Write a protein that binds this ligand. Sequence first.
Ligand SMILES: Nc1ncnc2c1ncn2[C@@H]1O[C@H](COP(=O)(O)OP(=O)(O)OP(O)(O)=S)[C@@H](O)[C@H]1O
Ligand SMILES: Nc1ncnc2c1ncn2[C@@H]1O[C@H](COP(=O)(O)OP(=O)(O)OP(O)(O)=S)[C@@H](O)[C@H]1O
Ligand SMILES: Nc1ncnc2c1ncn2[C@@H]1O[C@H](COP(=O)(O)OP(=O)(O)O)[C@@H](O)[C@H]1O
Ligand SMILES: [Mg+2]
Lengths: 95, 280, 276, 280, 90
Amino acid sequence: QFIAYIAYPLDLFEEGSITNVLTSIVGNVFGFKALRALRLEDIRFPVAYIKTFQGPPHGIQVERDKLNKYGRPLLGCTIKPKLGLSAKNYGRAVY
Amino acid sequence: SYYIAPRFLDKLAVHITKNFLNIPGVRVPLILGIHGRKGEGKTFQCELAFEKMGIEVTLISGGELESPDAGDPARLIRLRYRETAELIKVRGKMCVLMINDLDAGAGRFDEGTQYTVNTQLVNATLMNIADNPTDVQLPGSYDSNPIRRVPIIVTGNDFSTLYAPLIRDGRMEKFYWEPNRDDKVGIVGGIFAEDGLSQREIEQLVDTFPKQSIDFFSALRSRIYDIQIRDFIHKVGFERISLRVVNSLEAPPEFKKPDFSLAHLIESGNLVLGEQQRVD
Amino acid sequence: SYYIAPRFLDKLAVHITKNFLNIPGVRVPLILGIHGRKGEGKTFQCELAFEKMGIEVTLISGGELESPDAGDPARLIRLRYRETAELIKVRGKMCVLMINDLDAGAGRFDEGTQYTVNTQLVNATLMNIADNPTDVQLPGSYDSNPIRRVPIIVTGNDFSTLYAPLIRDGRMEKFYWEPNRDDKVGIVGGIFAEDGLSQREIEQLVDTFPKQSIDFFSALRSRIYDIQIRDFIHKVGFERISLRVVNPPEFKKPDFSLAHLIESGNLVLGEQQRVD
Amino acid sequence: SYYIAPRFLDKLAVHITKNFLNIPGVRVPLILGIHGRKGEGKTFQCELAFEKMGIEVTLISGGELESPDAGDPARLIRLRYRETAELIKVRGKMCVLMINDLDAGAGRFDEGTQYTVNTQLVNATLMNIADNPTDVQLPGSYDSNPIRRVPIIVTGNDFSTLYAPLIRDGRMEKFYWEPNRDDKVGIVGGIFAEDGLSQREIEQLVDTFPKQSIDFFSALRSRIYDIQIRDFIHKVGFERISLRVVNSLEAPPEFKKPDFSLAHLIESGNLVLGEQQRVD
Amino acid sequence: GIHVWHMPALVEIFGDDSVLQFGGGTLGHPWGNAPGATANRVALEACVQARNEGRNLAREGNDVIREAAKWSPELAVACELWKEIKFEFE
Ligand SMILES: Nc1ncnc2c1ncn2[C@@H]1O[C@H](COP(=O)(O)OP(=O)(O)OP(O)(O)=S)[C@@H](O)[C@H]1O
Ligand SMILES: Nc1ncnc2c1ncn2[C@@H]1O[C@H](COP(=O)(O)OP(=O)(O)OP(O)(O)=S)[C@@H](O)[C@H]1O
Ligand SMILES: Nc1ncnc2c1ncn2[C@@H]1O[C@H](COP(=O)(O)OP(=O)(O)O)[C@@H](O)[C@H]1O
Ligand SMILES: [Mg+2]
């Protein structure tokens, strides 16, 4: 068992597409019959390829400024059960 | 109708048989190598033996993997080995792959005196096959399924020092084939069987040239039409020998079957001896 | 199924392990030298040992240490050493360089023979690797980047005819291999383990032919088997030998009897005496 | 905690310093050549000396001074001299070139051995470097621009088999090494310093084996550790010894200090003499 | 990873309602893409013709490819390059 390092050129992939880069790397290598097992550990993205993506619509900094919440971690809750309740009974639990 | 020496046949039989046989506790050499003088007939005997047995043969030229502008020997030997293994299943008969002039016929002067990059590749490829005969792998489309083991024959003048590991390991067997008086009579007898020579006559030919290659005696038959051609030229005349033969619509030249006598063969033998003597 | 002598395996194992361990304050020899009589199983027992531990071997043949080019045998050693050092780094397991039959290349017998620069150089190279295992240079630009230490195993027939500085306690650990009665019994008992012979019967075979090498017994088995296979080919016939082999009926098992194993061995010695 | 012999340290110290210093009207040899007997510690005491002072070493192997290319070993020395000269300018500390085992490089054993031209050139290259330490020309276009002066240290068993003009007062400082009883006591005492023996006991070890090189005593210590190591291999198991040592997620094994007494050391010492006699 | 010799087995296993795609099989022909396509087409149509008549493609499959190659020069070159293999389907 070993870690293998592989380099790919920039002009091999479509700009602003996670779909294309993911299809290219992990397409037909995991079904190669001469390997028992394979796991992709990590990918390095270059600066030139990052600039083609939008990224997060807002980010951490803007989110806190819109909500006016700082100095503390945010709190959340999931309504139970997963399935069953009516629309009115759902909103009653939410309130 | 060519004669085969019993010893040569025996060495081929045992090697092929033993590899195909499945006896526990027994180790068998995969590769057999034959070294001898040139024009001994090692290649000719191999081809004949296989026909009598009826076993399929795959031939790989020595110059096909020695040439710099040929491809890749490492990729080639592997590909030929797989293809031969397929024959056994489909054909249902024993199949052998053999190589001629592994270190010769390249055009190079050394003849294994100095190694090459290409020389190293064959050693590497062969050693991998000898250790793991059951599984052989190409660059792509790796198959998990095992292949039937295939025997390998190799012929040359001599074997390089690089092969010494294999021989010590006992993975390779080396056979030195040298002709004898009995062998000569058989081979010479077979060549001239169609002509019709007495037993006493055949013995005289071998006795005339006791220390000769097998190739020489075969080459003697060729120089029987020489007298006819030389005499023919005279009737036609030197002025217009070319034009009539080269590009003219006429009856093709006809030659009566040459008379076969011992005297003619001795005279012809002497001329070839003289020429070979002067050249070397 | 093959019996390795416990003395032989322990000498190899302790040599390789100690090279790979970094015990502080101790200087270790990088070369282990095995010498003795011909055909005693110096090479064969190494291959069994390396298979057991599952450790990669880089071989250099003895008939390679003398070429028509000056320095070409010396350049090969450095090239093969650097290749093996990387295999320790990449494969992440123990790798060993084994030079077999060094006596032929770097040796110096009588003064009646004509030697070259290469004899001088092959001795010189092995000295410097043993001094600096971490600093071996490839021809061209110098790099001061350290490499992995690789142990060397060296087989020979005699080391008396070899440059004096290459044989010293600090540079080479010496091992004289002469198989004793107990070794012979084990090894011969390993060859004929499959056939089915009692301990007492194996003892008798060694006693009958005491002045024999390990190869002799293994060569004896092949002779017993070859007669049997030759007869089988004749009985079945050349015309249809392929039909009754691909898909072995009517094949009598080899003799393998103590009484005969003496008889056949005597015939081999008689054949050897004929040449002698 | 290794003992470096005062004579050896003084001789090497003064040679390097005197090159890097500039005294007007004094001409100094570039090469220092140390010779003696095998295993007296020429190479080894140099290495301790270079580490104490903390100075860079460029190493040339003696078995590298002959190649299939003509003038390629001549090119090598000229290249390595420039490389070392650059390290003085950049790093700003003393740097030294060392050719270990010159004897078997540019030397002639007998008057019957066929030599090449490379031997002739290697002698000449060192002659010219020692004459002009400042002007060494890299092949191609000429450039008259000085480089730093670099000292060279040379090891050998015998210098008697070497080109005569290369060994002379003005070109090479000669130094012959042979340790005395006081040196031996000091060095051997340095080896077993952590072990803990009395002065009288150290004397006795030297007395028992008086006709022995330094390497002999160091080789004793290797043999003592065998039992512990053999036990470790069994406990782990022969099947997976490689994994534990080379590539394992565990702390490397610890060995307790074996019993060190004069009686046990002499026992082991006689065992090493017996092994040497076996080959003799 | 399929060539002209895999044709009788693929036709029999996958049936009629299927698509057979040759990546390296068509392009890797010694003469080009156009003879490489014609070799594959002749090999397929000969097996379809033999199936309809009433012949087992396990026993007579190799015989059909050899018979079709007698009149098709494009297939004869393809049979020389790629060697015949034996499928063990029953
Ligand atoms: N331990 C063994 N078990 C079974 N067969 C052995 C064994 N040892 C040796 N043999 C056989 O006898 C031969 C021994 O010769 P080698 O392996 O070449 O070693 P060697 O001949 O002692 O080394 P040289 O020639 O002195 S450098 C082998 O080829 C085997 O066929
Ligand atoms: N000063 C020392 N202190 C401790 N051990 C030493 C000392 N000097 C030498 N040794 C040991 O003895 C060995 C001497 O080896 P070398 O340095 O090669 O001697 P040498 O005279 O250069 O040998 P030749 O002539 O090249 S063979 C070393 O491997 C050390 O283990
Ligand atoms: N048994 C034989 N009967 C007839 N001709 C033979 C025989 N053996 C060899 N030859 C002749 O030898 C020539 C080919 O030699 P070849 O087989 O290549 O020998 P080698 O491989 O030893 O060089 C041909 O002219 C062939 O007729
Ligand atoms: Mg030294």
